[PDB]
From a paper:
To better resolve the disordered density, we refined a less populated class containing Rad4–Rad33/DNA at 9.2 Å resolution (Map 2, EMDB-22588), as well as a class containing Rad4 BHD3 (but not including BHD1-2 and TGD)-Rad33-DNA at 7.9 Å resolution (Map 3, EMDB-22576). Although the main body of Rad4 (residues 123–632) was in close proximity to the C-terminal helicase domain of Ssl2 (C-Ssl2, residues 549–776), it apparently had little direct contact with C-Ssl2. However, an unassigned EM density bridging C-terminal end of Rad4 BHD3 (residue 632) and C-Ssl2 indicated the presence of Rad33: Rad33 and human centrin 2 (CETN2) are both EF-hand calcium-binding proteins that interact with the conserved C-terminal region of Rad4 and XPC, respectively, and stimulate NER activity. To resolve this region, we further refined this map up to ~7.9 Å resolution (Map 3) using a mask that excludes the TGD and BHD1 domains of Rad4. This allowed us to reliably dock a homology model of the Rad33 C-terminal lobe (residues 94–169) bound to the Rad4 C-terminal region (C-Rad4; residues 648–664) into the corresponding density, guided by cross-links of high confidence between C-Rad4 and the C-terminal region of Ssl2 (e.g., Rad4 S660–Ssl2 K796). The N-terminal lobe of Rad33 (residues 26–93) was not observed in the map. The conserved hydrophobic surface of C-Rad4 consisting of Thr651, Ile658, Leu66271 pack against hydrophobic residues of BHD3 (Phe585, Leu586, Thr624). Our model suggests that this is due to the role of C-XPC (Rad4) in binding to CETN2 (Rad33) which in turn directly interacts with the C-terminal helix of XPB (Ssl2). By contrast, the same superposition showed that Rad33 and XPA(Rad14) would encounter steric clash with each other as both bind to the C-terminal helix of C-Ssl2. This suggests that Rad33 and Rad14 are mutually exclusive when they bind to Ssl2.
Numbering used by the authors:
A (entry chain 0): 557 to 754
B (entry chain 4): 22 to 94, 113 to 323
C (entry chain 2): 7 to 286, 328 to 507
D (entry chain 1): 168 to 355, 368 to 393, 465 to 519, 537 to 567, 573 to 639
E (entry chain 6): 107 to 457
Amino acid sequence: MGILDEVWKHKLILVETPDAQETSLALETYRKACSNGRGAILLSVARGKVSEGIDFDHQYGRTVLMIGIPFQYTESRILKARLEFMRENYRIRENDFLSFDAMRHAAQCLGRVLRGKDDYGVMVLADRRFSRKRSQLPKWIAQGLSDADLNLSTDMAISNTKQFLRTMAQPTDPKDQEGVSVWSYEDLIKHQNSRKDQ
Amino acid sequence: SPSLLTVIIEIAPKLWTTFDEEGNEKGSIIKVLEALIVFLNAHLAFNSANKVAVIAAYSQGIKYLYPESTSALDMYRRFRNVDETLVEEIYKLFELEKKQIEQNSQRSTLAGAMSAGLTYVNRISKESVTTSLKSRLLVLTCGSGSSKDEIFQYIPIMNCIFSATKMKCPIDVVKIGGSKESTFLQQTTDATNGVYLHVESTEGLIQYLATAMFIDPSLRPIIVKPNHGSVDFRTSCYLTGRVVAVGFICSVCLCVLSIIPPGNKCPACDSQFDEHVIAKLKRK
Amino acid sequence: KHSVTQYLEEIPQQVQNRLYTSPATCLAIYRILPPLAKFFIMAMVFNENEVPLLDLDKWVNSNGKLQFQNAIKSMKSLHLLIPNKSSGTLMINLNPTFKISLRNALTGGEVQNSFGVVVEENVVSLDLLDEYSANKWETILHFMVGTPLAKIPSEKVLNLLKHSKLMEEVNSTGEFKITNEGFQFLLQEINSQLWTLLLQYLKMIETSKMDLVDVLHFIFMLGALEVGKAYKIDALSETQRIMLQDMRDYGLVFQKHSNDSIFYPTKLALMLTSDTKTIRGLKNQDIPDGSLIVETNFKIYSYSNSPLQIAVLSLFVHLKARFVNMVLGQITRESIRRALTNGITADQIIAYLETHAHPQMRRLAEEKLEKKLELDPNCKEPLQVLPPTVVDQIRLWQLELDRVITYEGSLYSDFETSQEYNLLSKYAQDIGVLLWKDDKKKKFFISKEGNSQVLDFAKR
Amino acid sequence: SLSKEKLLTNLKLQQSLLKGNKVLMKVFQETVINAGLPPSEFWSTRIPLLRAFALSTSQKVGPYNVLSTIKPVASSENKVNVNLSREKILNIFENYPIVKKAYTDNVPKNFKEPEFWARFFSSKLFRKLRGEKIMQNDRGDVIIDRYLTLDQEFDRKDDDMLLHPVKKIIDLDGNIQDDPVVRGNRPDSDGTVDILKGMNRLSEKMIMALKNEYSNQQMLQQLSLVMDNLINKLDLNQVVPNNEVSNKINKRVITAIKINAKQAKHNNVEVKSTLPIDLLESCRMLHTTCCEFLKHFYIHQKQASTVKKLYNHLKDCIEKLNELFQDVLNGDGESMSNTCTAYLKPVLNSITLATHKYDEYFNEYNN
Amino acid sequence: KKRTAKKNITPYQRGIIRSLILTLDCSEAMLEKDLRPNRHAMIIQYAIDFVHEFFDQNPISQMGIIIMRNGLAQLVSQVSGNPQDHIDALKSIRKQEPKGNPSLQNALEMARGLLLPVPAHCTREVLIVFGSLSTTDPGDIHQTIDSLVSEKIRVKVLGLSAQVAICKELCKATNYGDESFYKILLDETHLKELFNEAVTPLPVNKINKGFTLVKMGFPTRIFEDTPTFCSCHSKLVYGGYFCPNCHSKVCSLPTVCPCCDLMLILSTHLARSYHHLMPLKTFAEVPTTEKFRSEDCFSCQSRFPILKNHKNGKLLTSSRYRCEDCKQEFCVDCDVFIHEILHNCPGCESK
Ligand SMILES: [Zn+2]
Ligand SMILES: [Zn+2]
Ligand SMILES: [Zn+2]
Ligand SMILES: [Zn+2]
């Protein structure tokens, strides 16, 4: 289709390819483009090497996606055999373990897009099955995922993220609400929790 | 097109005595007061019932006269109410006079008067969004001696000018006193599109008033009646005191200094200058 | 509009001075003159000496001389002044009675007439009897226009309307319908209506026991300000008292009951001269009650209403079923053809809509307005401040029923040479006053501005 | 890039700017062709115009989009010379050497306008951009196929020329597998991988072409109280308010005011000989710029001889204008000559004053 | 519940002279539909407003306008001190429509070239109204930024609805590090006030730099009318000014003499400056129950003070926002008016 032409018109595309060297080269160009003007898209694989160690800071990551939810049994029955062992040896059923692994990889992918608290960034998902897994996710992800944000359509998704990006762009720096969530130098911890010694 | 003529009559009993001192004591301000009352009535009649206002400047402050801030809590007869109320207030003000009143002769609150009057004009215009008021104020001053040109009021006067121009409010001035062209006032009327009138003392102004102090409401096709040229060769050197032509103005200080630089620390802001720059100036 | 000022100058000079004896009348007529004349008169009032005209010419500059002629022609027509060819020059000065009366009025004169008012316990409430005066005015308006029930008992008022031919109604059959006079009555909102009625009372009440000086004294004393105390009791002529009672019957006097008291100064006399706000059992709150409808879709959307007002609207639009806030009506070529049957011109209605029905069209006229006058030179396209579309449709209906073209001015001649004619034509094209011209005939029928300017240039 | 002496010597640039404005070339020639000014200083006044022009000129457009686009965003106009034809083709050439070389090689024969670009569509726009055409229209022939073969290994060697030893944060190479010697599995169909390498290579080439960096008190109160009383003493007879009192005084006031009205009125807020008017205007512009150069130089300072030449020329110009006035009085008469003298009075005074000031300074330096 | 600036902590220095080179953005991005006509039309309208305002408040500075179309920076108004030229230029542009991509780098380089003639005491500046989310540079950018900060050229930019990393770096870089100048907007009114706050001179905490006396002279109006004659545009103009030294006519302006090249001013420009240098202490809002002061205004005479015990109404607040040094009341309207338009505090003038 012509779909790639448009994203070309806006940003850069940087695919993920099996040879590690070329992958590293592409990744560093992605960083170099992000910190430069032109926006750049890197699309990779959840099971793949990219998610393993690479970090995505403020600039280098704003909006991860999860096209689909990662599952393995595409291929053959080694997972089936291990899962057989799992069920017989541990009181764990197939779909339980499979969902657990999938959400493990999903959370590992998602967590990369933040570094500090000054950073921020959308973390969308995409699949019907995700809606029921909302509890499998790690807690701190789940908290931000309110109920009303479930099975949203793409259109309301774009609306919401637009509002987000605008709002976060604001220099919302009261610096007195940050005495709540930063525990400033040597004191707020000292004061607060030396009193909380209760 | 209604107009808000807000006279600003200053009355220094020091300057009132000077007026008695000037020429003969052939009549106190009473002449001016009566002429002002009549002119005020005239304007009050001319238009379609357009309000007025009057402020004073006595030796130790200013106080309104006509709009008559909450106190309890003939001829068309509104003329009657305006005039009798004004005169009652002014007699009250004259009661406000004594030696402690004689004490704070250091200043002359005219600038405060003009500023407050402008604020009043803004208040009235803002409240009366409908039927926009082509307003314009006035100034009556008893020109006395003992100070050839008081300058400690120089800036607030010009701030008044700029406010006036932005607010589009011509401001006409009538100085009654010695033949000393009130330079700042002169520039004020000229810049804000006004009219200057340096009458002699004892003549019944009413003709002067009704002639050349009544054509500024909302007309302006008519030649104003200003005196001789209004040279803008502005303030004398802060250090020297002689009127400057080819100025020499420091910096962030902004003070205008004569051809005599003290060589360092312009004598209004402590700012030593580049001696290299000093020599560059001295290169002449 | 008969332009009562024209009636004022109609009356002869001696009776004009007779009127000028009354200072309050002098003041009231001062209120009416064009501003140029106002300023000139205020100049002359004090310097007790005639003044050459040359000064009063040089007082005014360029692009505003038209008003100079307006003022001088008006003042001469009503003869407030006396031009004086003393030394062959022009020694202007007012009718000295006018001057002295005015000057007395400015500084405590002896005008016991204007001072006829009395100050006492003005127990008159704002709504108090003001609502009664408004109700009387509405009742007479409805009876003249013709309501379902016309309680208008003004036998004198009815006689004035009929003999004056106030409205095209068959008074012989009792009809009170809209004629050309009736159409105008529907047109002149408040000042026009009150003025037409006052003129009618003047014309009808002109035979015997008039005392026109006392008549105008009473009228203007009413319009001047609240006389209040002792007005009806003391401050009135005998025929003056009769005229005051008649006016109070006509609503224009808000006299209290008991048939003997001070003058009851109703707001209406104020409305005679004010040219200002128009708003008047015990309920009536509306700064914008009149909820008319008029947009670009030529429809009638009404929420706010007033029964006589909406009847006036119906005078050029159909009615089918009155609704709660609305009345079934849609303005079309037929709707105004209703008034075209009465021959009503689509002229007064223009400014009427621009002014009336605005209590419901405030936001409409604001969005059309958009302050697109200072923005007009920059953005060359108007934002339909005064809707031209509706104007074009109305003109089209008017044109459909009319088919005739006329022009104002006067025929001109004595263009001896082609040079003068060509130069005058070029100057007129510069000023846009030449309707049409031709050098072959050396004639045209336009406004007198070109001739005026050429004559002034030649003589001075 | 821009320097005072550089713009001074940029003679071709200066003449181009002469072509820029008719007014400019006119004033310049009449300052030159009239045996007047060396162009050097004439520009020395006008330098900022030169700098501005030069910068407005040498302004390389970016590579980036249009460069790319020239392969993607350009798939429709199969007609003649499409949008930005020369611009697009030069973007292509800087973007891809191969097409430039092929077009150049196919100038003496085989026109690259219509048929060249037609076959180019197939050949290149299959080679670059979309998937391997392989089958279908294999019009990639002759020069097309040759350049295809070339560009293959060419892009190869380019990519070779691209490999940095990336800083060890990102080093995926050393990161993967080059820690251990392990035994995994792998399970995650040729072609299109080349497509991905194509887009990577394009982007990196673009970025690299950009890293390339190519009495008081007592009596006071007394009088005050007196007045206060007078006021309180009923009085305030507004009737007695002057009115004008002395008719004479009144008259005098009126006199003053009409005098002032007249004088200020004299402010009416159209020459005869249009050709002589324009000629005089040229003379004024000439004398103005001449004096401009002096009042620059006479202030600034060691180029005294230049000032001397300027002064001699200015004196010549003054005498010239004197003769001009003489001729004007002779021919145009007086009224027209009077109008000319009025039009030229300010400039004449200024230049005369400049001459006098120079004479004074020269006397001071000499004596 | 109050929204006030706590304190002004550079009331000692500003750049009084300026040479601000506003650079618009006329590129395909500005054609989206987020602001009522578009981005572009609203932008240019507000740009006109800002031009008027800025040349009012800083009436001694110059200004130049730059667009960014088709990746090119095409100067649309030479750096000049006459507002009308720039106004007309913007008028002309507004009827023309954007294209191409915004080439921030080219605009930056064109500016840096443009501001070279500006002398040392004058201060430079740029104001990028950046609208898009990308640039397209024909060169290194950090090269340019380094050249900029080498040439002491502060830059402030007003992004549209996003934050671009490079622009943030740019503002943080030139302005001596202290990042506050990359303010981006979230509403049209926010945009109006953005330009408004761009009008004023710009302090952060100035490094100790060269401060230099500047020669200038004031003119005197002319008298004659028929003798219409001009030495700055070579026309007939019914009467103007005289350079005190060059001694040649100059059409009305604060312009520089076109004969001897010295600055010309009257004073009122200097008066505007004075107003900007030493402003007032922000008026304090008096305590609701602890005021016990006069029940009126002071500068005006308003009747908006309190209500005296009304459950929640009186519990709200007491409109008595009163300035410090004169310690006199002032209703809200009077305080807003004083702190906006005229800066002579009424009472503080009088003592
Ligand atoms: Zn000029
Ligand atoms: Zn000069
Ligand atoms: Zn107030
Ligand atoms: Zn204060």
